[PDB]
């Protein structure tokens, strides 16, 4: 596929998550990982992950809380650098 | 979970997260421990900040907690750096669970320690300053309580990626049982 697909949480601790996705068939220049409490009790945050990876660790989370997590992919193969269809999941820690 | 090769990687990740969490916890314990030295020094002089009794009440079992978690962290770290299906970590978790008596003593005393420390921060001049820059004091005193409550959660999170064919499985399951029993008794 041309864009990241099949985002999922594959492991967890009470305050951290390992997300994983299917890497696209392009050279990814940069990933941006976005996450925040789905209900807005704390702000949305972002961090960067190298394009050679297809997993990311999110730490410092609150236990027993709903989070929304989104992966953005930047590639010089993409018309406007960022891919046309970022992928999101919800997860309760 | 059914792919044992993926499970091996997931188990390493959980153990890496436990290491990072222990690092953070050990730093908070150290933050509590550091003012004990000058406090105990001044207590035996004619210008004490807190009496020895107040020190023993507030800081009860903090050195002991530090020792058992330092033992656990130092034992676990090299095993994660040499990771394979052959690696076994279960005895470390059993050993920590065997030491839950330290936590029982700490939790039993927490309310008294919390009150004693809140009094002095509201009234004592030098100790309120100490509790203001702890590498607050009352925030750190809750760390052992908040954490042991999550002990069965982390053990379950590790067992989720440990197959029944691996000899760590019965050890981790037993540590979880003992930890569940401890939480039930509290």
Author numbering:
A (entry chain A): 3 to 95
B (entry chain B): 489 to 623, 638 to 688
From the paper:
The Bcr-Abl oncoprotein is expressed from the Philadelphia (Ph) chromosome, which is formed upon the t(9;22) reciprocal chromosomal translocation that fuses the breakpoint cluster region (BCR) gene with the Abelson tyrosine kinase (ABL1). Bcr-Abl is a constitutively active tyrosine kinase and is selectively inhibited by imatinib (Gleevec), which became a paradigm for targeted cancer therapy. Due to the different translocation breakpoints, p210 contains a predicted Dbl-homology (DH) and Pleckstrin-homology (PH) tandem domain that p190 lacks. Here we provide high-resolution structures of the DH and PH domains that unravel unique structural features.
